[PDB]
Amino acid sequence: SMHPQAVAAVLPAGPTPKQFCPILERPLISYTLQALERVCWIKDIVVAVTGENMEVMKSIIQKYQHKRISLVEAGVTRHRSIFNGLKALAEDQINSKLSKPEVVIIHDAVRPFVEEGVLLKVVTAAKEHGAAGAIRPLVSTVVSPSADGCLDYSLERARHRASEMPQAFLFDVIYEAYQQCSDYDLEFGTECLQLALKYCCTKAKLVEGSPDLWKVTYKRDLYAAESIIKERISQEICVVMDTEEDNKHVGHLLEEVLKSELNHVKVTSEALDQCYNFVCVNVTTSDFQETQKLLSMLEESSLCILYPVVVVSVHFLDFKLVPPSQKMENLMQIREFAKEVKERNILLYGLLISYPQDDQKLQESLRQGAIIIASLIKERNSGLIGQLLIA
């Protein structure tokens, strides 16, 4: 209850920039906006986009239900885009629609893994100093080429750092800096903290940042970001079951084995909240009554808007190696359901567990079940939807 007061954010969102490149069919900028919106004390988030993209952005705001977002037109350069964002926040006009912050954050649309910690640190350092920025060590040596493309000099790696986002400023300082800024610097400047230093004699505080702060620039960064996203949504599973005592027991049985086999995963069970993996468990039918309920409940929801939701429909059934033909015929309705719910961003898979078995055989099947489920969750791959797997 001690959150910074009067804070807003500005994102310039103007190889080619990757802010609209999809990850799991969702544009990268949407993940960044989500990460910023989760920080309750950032009152307004001002995003600069170009005219050609203004409609894509608005559609993105609607589709993913982003809150506290005000759009402004980007300039041709990054400093111009940021200035327009600050203008919109200045509350110094008849036209102004937004409270003037004390502290403003600058972030980039292609840096989706920002969290409340580093933000708090840069906001706090900026109150005390006027300006602040996240830094990282250099991995590569920096060099200066001559006109003919030969080594002129090398810089001492230990005396330099890479400037990263987020940055934060006392609003009046940075706004005043932009108002004094030469048009040359607006065109060719890359670094807001250098503006504050040159035009307001404000020496920014450099805060140490995590490896997560990097900017998505290349294809390989998109790969890395996809993986981090998929890992983070793999850490929670909800096992769902009927009130029937048979179903509750196998459901809880599976819950327990998922907990013990998948270390560092939060597993819960609900009868029949930011969870994207569901394990629906059934003994008492050769059908999908429980799974159908769960799907209809998710087809409505906005869980499916934000990330692909994985649903594993699990059936405990009596059989030696293969279940009887007629029961297997019923289970194959999974294919049809999977095809339908794929359209709503749900990935539906089936898993058969032989029940009952001898103790050790059943233990092994439960472990295999857990591994299979973890695998389907990890990969989140649409290619295997509708399959009936066996533990």
Residues numbered 214 to 273 that lie near its own copies (CB under 8 A) are 214-215, 217-221, 223-228
Please count the other Cβ atoms lying within 10 Å of the Cβ belonging to residue 155: 12
- 58 vs 219, which CB is nearer to its own copies? 219
- 50 vs 124, which CB is nearer to Cl ion? 50
Q: Among 57-65, 213-221, 253-261, 294-302, which window interacts with its own copies (CB under 8 A)? A: 213-221
288 binds, among Mg ion, Cl ion, its own copies, none (CB under 5 to 8 A by kind): none
Collapsed DSSP state (helix, strand, coil) of residue 210: coil
How far apart are CB 284 and its own copies at their closest, in Å? 21
Q: Among 45-53, 61-69, 208-216, 255-263, which window interacts with its own copies (CB under 8 A)? A: 208-216
- For the CA atoms of 303, 306, 308, 311, the dihedral, rounded to the nearest 10 degrees, stands at -10
How far apart are CB 374 and its own copies at their closest, in Å? 7
The single residue among 147, 159, 243, 358 that binds its own copies, judged by CB under 8 A, is 159
376 binds, among Cl ion, its own copies, Mg ion, none (CB under 5 to 8 A by kind): its own copies
Distance CA 314, CA 245 (A): 16
Give yes or no for residue 178 binding Cl ion (CB under 5 A). no
Residue whose structure tokens are 């002129």? 152
β-strand pairing of 103-106 with 161-170? antiparallel
Give yes or no for residue 80 binding Cl ion (CB under 5 A). yes
Joined tokens for residue 54: 């203004």
The amino acid present at 367, given as its one-letter code, is R
Distance CA 259, CA 70 (A): 43
Residue whose structure tokens are 């309705």? 333
- 120 vs 206, which CB is nearer to its own copies? 206
What residues numbered 366-385 form the site for its own copies, per CB under 8 A? 371-372, 374-376, 378-379, 381-384
What residues numbered 314-333 form the site for its own copies, per CB under 8 A? 321-322, 324-325, 328-329, 332
Residue whose structure tokens are 């003037």? 100
Please count the other Cβ atoms lying within 10 Å of the Cβ belonging to residue 158: 8
Residue whose structure tokens are 């885009």? 81
205 binds, among Cl ion, its own copies, Mg ion, none (CB under 5 to 8 A by kind): its own copies
Q: Among 77-85, 221-229, 259-267, 302-310, which window interacts with Cl ion (CB under 5 A)? A: 77-85
* 194 membership: H or E segment, kind and range: helix 192-200
Distance CA 277, CA 198 (A): 51
Q: Among 71-79, 91-99, 185-193, 256-264, which window interacts with its own copies (CB under 8 A)? A: 185-193
How far apart are CB 187 and Cl ion at their closest, in Å? 11
Distance CA 23, CA 31 (A): 9
Joined tokens for residue 70: 């005000």
Give yes or no for residue 147 binding its own copies (CB under 8 A). no
Chain contacts with Cl ion (rule: CB under 5 A): 80, 83
